[PDB]
Design a protein around this ligand. Sequence first.
Ligand SMILES: Nc1ncnc2c1ncn2[C@@H]1O[C@H](COP(=O)(O)OP(=O)(O)OP(=O)(O)O)[C@@H](O)[C@H]1O
Ligand SMILES: [Mg+2]
Length: 249
Amino acid sequence: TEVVMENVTAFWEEGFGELFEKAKGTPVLKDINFKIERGQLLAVAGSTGAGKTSLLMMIMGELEPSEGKIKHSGRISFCSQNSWIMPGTIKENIIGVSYDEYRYRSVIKACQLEEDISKFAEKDNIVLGGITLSGGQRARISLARAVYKDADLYLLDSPFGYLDVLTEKEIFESCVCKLMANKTRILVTSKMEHLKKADKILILHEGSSYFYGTFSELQNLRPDFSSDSFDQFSAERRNSILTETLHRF
Ligand SMILES: Nc1ncnc2c1ncn2[C@@H]1O[C@H](COP(=O)(O)OP(=O)(O)OP(=O)(O)O)[C@@H](O)[C@H]1O
Ligand SMILES: [Mg+2]
């Protein structure tokens, strides 16, 4: 499926949203414009509270526009920024109930879970919730769950938490870039590497679109904004550097 937003403005409060819709307090998102083709990657970046998760919620019909149009048709797979583990086996946590051996093995390889599974006698029959897992292991199982699901659009809201720099790089490449090459997907990130590899980018600030386009277009239109070691900074630091640059401009 292709996902399109045209002049989208939305309010979390239902009452103020109805007022703006009729007319045409603060919008969580305003005048949002993007278009993603089938099999493309959109990277979403921005300051804290810019409306990144809210944009995903709007795509999932949790938040409705007051003006403008959202065009999308398809099943959505959502990977939240906070991992969750069902009391059950690793396999069930990833597949649910629908099993597909080739899809399953592809996903666990791409999320580097083979080494984790081999650690136990029961293998992927090991019961979680029970066995306790590290942040990074929980993150990777959640991502594998989201990616395994048969869906038409994959929404990945900062799914690489508690993973080290090197692991996040390998999995972004193996999962998001390779395995999911033909899937329509939206990634929320503050990693300059991911914006670079994306087909389109959207940079948000206080509900407003700072920039929509390619990373090359970001080089063309925003040279002072563009101006190696950035992705080495922590999530918190990367956020406050991006925040300040968006405030200045
Ligand atoms: N379900 C909701 N109902 C009402 N307000 C909400 C809801 N979800 C988020 N908000 C508000 O909308 C604003 C933007 O939140 P959102 O989570 O979309 O930002 P974000 O960019 O994803 O933040 P972060 O960078 O911390 O993940 C915040 O003021 C938040 O409190
Ligand atoms: Mg968020």
